Design a protein around this ligand. Structure first.
Ligand SMILES: Nc1nc(N[C@H]2C[C@@H]3CC[C@H]2C3)sc1C(=O)c1ccccc1[N+](=O)[O-]
Lengths: 252, 311
C-alpha cells in the first residue's frame, strides 16, 4: 500500500502505546528519546545523517504497530540503526553496534567480557529484535529520504547558504521532535521546514509572476493555512527543546 | 504473541516440489492454500550468517520491490515462519517455463517470429532495469523465465546490484562463466549495463544453437574461446584495452579471427538476426549495442514480425 505508513491525528492518538496506558505526552517523549539515542550512536558509529534518518523513520513506524511497553526505545534503537546502516550500505559490524550502544546507555559501566553469557546473549537479543523490526515493517525499507526534497526545494527558491542551512536544520529536528514523517509526505514537510526557516530568518520568498506562491511548485496540496499550523507546531517543540534554537539563533 | 500485520506466515502456501531440483538452491514450487495460485518460495539462506539478517538478502529485496514490470519477475511478498529458530521466504509468482529447459527440450520448436518476441521482451526487460540504475549481473538462459501465456520474465536478482556515475569499485566475480563479458575477465571493476547486454547476445545466439556457445573452464580458457569468435583483444579493435593489468594472460597477441557471423551463419538463417547478435557480442563494452538501439534494430521491424507464444 502507498499510504500504509501514513496516519491521521485520530489514528496517532489510538497508538498501540495508548492502548497499554501510555499518555500522548509520554509517547512522543519516548519517540524523541529513541531519536536522540539513534543520533548519538550514529555519530559515534560515524554513519551518515541519512542512515540515522532512515533509522528514525523505522523507529517511528515500528511504534505504530508495537507498544513502547513491550519494546523499549533503548532496545529497538540499536537494532534499528544496526539495520539502517546495512540497508543504506554503511554496514556496521554487530559487535561494534553493541559496544557503542552500551557506552551510550551505561557510560560508567564496563564493557562486558565479550565471551560471557551477558554478552553472547545481548548479541542474540539484537539479531532477534532486528528480525522483529523487519517483520513489523513488512520488509519495506526503502525510505523516501527527506533531505533531498529539502535540498531540491531550497534551490527552487534561490536561498542563501544560511537559509538553506537553517532549512536543513529544521528538517532534521522535525524528524526527531515531531511525528510529521508519519503524517505528511516528504515534500509537504520540506515546504514546512523552508517556510519556518524563512520566518526565523526574516526572509520572504517573492510571490511568483503568475500570482501564485512558491510552494505550489513542489506539491499542489500545500496551503498557507496548513504551513502556518505545522510551522507553529514545529516551532513550539523547538522552543521546548533546550539549546536547539541557540544553534541557529542570530547572535550578531 | 508479537503483533505482525505485514508479514504473513509462509504456511499460507503448501509446498509442492523442490523446483531447482538442486540447481537454484532451496527454492520450492508451492500453492496458495485458498486460491490455488502457484508461487516460488526461496528460503533466505542463513548458514554462516554472523551479522544478522543478510545484507545480500536486504539488497535483493530492495531491488525486487523497486523493479515492477511485465518482463521482470514479481516478488509478491516476504514471509516468515513462527519461531520457538525461524526463517524468511521470498515469495515470487510462479512461472511455468524457463528458456534453458525450453532450448534443452527437442520437442519444443522456435519459429523466427517467436524468437524475435522472446528477444524483444528480454531487451525490453533489460531497458527497464538499467533505466532503474540496476545491473542484473547474472544473465543466462536458466534465469529467463516464460509464463504459460508466453510472457518472458527476467529472474534471479540474487547477485544483482544498484549502479551509478573517483572510480566505481564493483565486485568482479559476477555472471556465470559462459555468459561473462570480456571486460570482467580482463579484471574490470568500473563497468555497467553493457555486461548484461553481452549476456543477452550469448542467449540470443543460444536461441538458434540450442546450447551455450562458449563453454569455458577458467577465466583464461573462457577468454580464449571469446577471442576465437569476436577477433582478438587489440587496442585497434578496443581503444585502451592495453591499459588493463591482466592483459597478456594466455591472450594470443596475434591469433585473431574476425567474426561471430561466420560460426553462426550455419544455425541463424535470417540475415538481420546475425547482425543484431554481432552488435551485441562486441569486444569493447563502450561500443556494444544498448538495450534502446537494439530494440530499434531492423530485426524487430521486418518480416516475419514478432509474434506471441505457445511453443
Ligand atoms: N518465479 C519463478 N518461477 C520459476 N519456475 C521454475 C519452474 C521451472 C524450472 C525453472 C522455472 C520453470 S523459477 C522462479 C524464480 O524466479 C526464482 C525464485 C527464487 C529463486 C530463484 C529463482 N529463479 O532462479 O528463477
Amino acid at each position: 500500500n502507498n499510504k500504509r505508513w501514513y496516519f491521521t491525528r485520530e489514528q496517532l492518538e489510538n497508538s498501540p502505546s495508548r492502548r497499554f496506558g501510555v499518555d500522548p505526552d509520554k509517547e512522543l517523549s519516548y519517540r524523541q528519546q529513541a531519536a536522540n539515542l539513534l543520533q548519538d550512536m550514529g555519530q559515534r558509529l560515524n554513519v551518515s545523517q541519512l542512515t540515522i534518518n532512515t533509522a528514525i523513520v523505522y523507529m517511528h513506524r515500528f511504534y505504530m504497530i508495537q507498544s513502547f511497553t513491550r519494546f523499549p526505545g533503548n532496545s529497538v534503537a540499536p537494532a534499528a540503526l544496526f539495520l539502517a546502516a546495512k540497508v543504506e550500505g554503511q554496514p556496521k559490524k554487530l559487535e561494534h553496534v553493541i559496544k557503542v550502544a552500551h557506552t551510550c546507555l551505561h557510560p560508567q559501566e564496563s564493557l562486558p567480557d565479550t565471551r560471557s553469557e551477558a554478552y553472547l546473549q545481548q548479541v542474540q537479543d539484537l539479531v532477534i529484535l532486528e528480525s522483529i523490526i523487519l517483520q513489523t515493517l513488512g520488509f519495506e525499507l526503502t525510505i523516501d529520504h527527506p533531505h533531498t526534497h529539502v535540498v531540491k526545494c531550497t534551490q527552487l527558491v534561490r536561498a542563501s547558504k544560511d537559509l538553506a542551512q537553517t532549512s536543513y536544520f529544521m528538517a532534521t529536528n522535525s524528524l526527531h521532535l515531531t511525528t510529521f514523517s508519519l503524517q505528511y509526505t516528504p515534500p509537504v514537510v520540506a515546504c514546512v521546514c523552508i517556510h519556518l526557516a524563512c520566518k526565523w530568518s526574516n526572509w520572504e520568498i517573492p510571490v511568483s509572476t503568475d500570482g501564485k506562491h512558491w510552494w505550489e511548485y513542489v506539491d499542489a496540496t500545500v496551503t498557507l493555512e496548513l504551513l502556518d499550523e505545522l510551522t507553529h507546531e514545529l516551532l513550539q517543540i523547538l522552543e521546548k527543546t533546550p539549546n536547539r534554537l541557540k544553534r541557529i539563533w542570530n547572535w550578531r | 504473541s508479537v503483533e505482525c500485520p505485514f508479514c504473513d506466515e509462509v504456511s499460507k502456501y503448501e509446498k509442492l516440489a523442490k523446483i531447482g531440483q538442486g540447481t537454484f538452491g532451496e527454492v520450492f514450487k508451492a500453492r496458495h492454500r485458498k486460491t490455488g495460485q502457484k508461487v516460488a518460495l526461496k528460503k533466505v539462506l542463513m548458514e554462516n550468517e554472523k551479522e544478522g539478517f543478510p545484507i545480500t538478502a536486504l539488497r535483493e529485496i530492495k531491488i525486487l520491490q523497486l523493479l515492477k514490470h511485465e518482463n521482470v519477475v514479481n516478488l509478491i511478498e516476504i514471509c516468515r515462519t513462527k519461531a520457538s529458530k525461524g526463517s524468511i521466504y521470498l515469495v515470487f509468482d510462479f512461472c511455468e517455463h524457463d528458456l534453458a529447459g525450453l532450448l534443452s527440450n527437442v520437442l519444443v520448436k522456435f519459429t523466427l517470429s517467436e524468437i524475435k518476441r522472446v528477444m524483444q521482451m528480454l531487451l525490453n526487460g533489460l531497458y527497464y532495469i538499467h533505466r532503474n540504475k540496476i545491473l542484473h549481473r547474472d544473465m543466462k538462459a536458466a534465469n529467463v523465465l516464460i509464463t504459460r501465456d508466453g510472457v518472458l520474465k527476467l529472474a534471479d536478482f540474487g547477485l544483482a546490484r544498484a549502479f551509478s556515475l573517483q572510480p566505481n569499485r564493483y565486485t568482479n566475480r559476477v555472471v556465470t562463466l559462459w555468459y561473462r563479458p570480456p571486460e570482467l575477465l580482463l579484471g574490470e571493476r568500473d563497468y555497467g549495463p553493457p555486461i548484461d547486454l553481452w549476456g543477452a547476445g550469448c542467449i540470443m545466439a543460444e536461441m538458434w544453437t540450442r546450447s551455450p556457445i562458449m563453454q569455458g573452464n577458467t577465466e583464461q580458457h573462457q577468454l580464449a574461446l571469446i577471442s576465437q569468435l569476436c577477433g582478438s583483444i587489440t587496442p585497434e579493435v578496443w581503444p585502451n584495452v592495453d591499459n588493463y593489468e591482466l592483459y597478456e594472460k594466455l591472450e594470443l597477441v596475434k591469433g585473431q579471427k574476425r567474426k561471430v557471423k561466420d560460426r553462426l551463419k550455419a544455425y541463424v538463417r535470417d540475415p538481420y538476426a546475425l547482425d543484431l547478435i554481432d552488435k551485441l557480442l562486441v569486444l569493447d563494452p563502450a561500443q556494444r549495442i544498448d538495450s534502446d538501439d537494439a530494440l530499434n534494430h531492423d530485426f524487430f521491424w521486418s518480416d516475419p514480425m514478432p509474434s506471441d507464444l505457445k511453443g
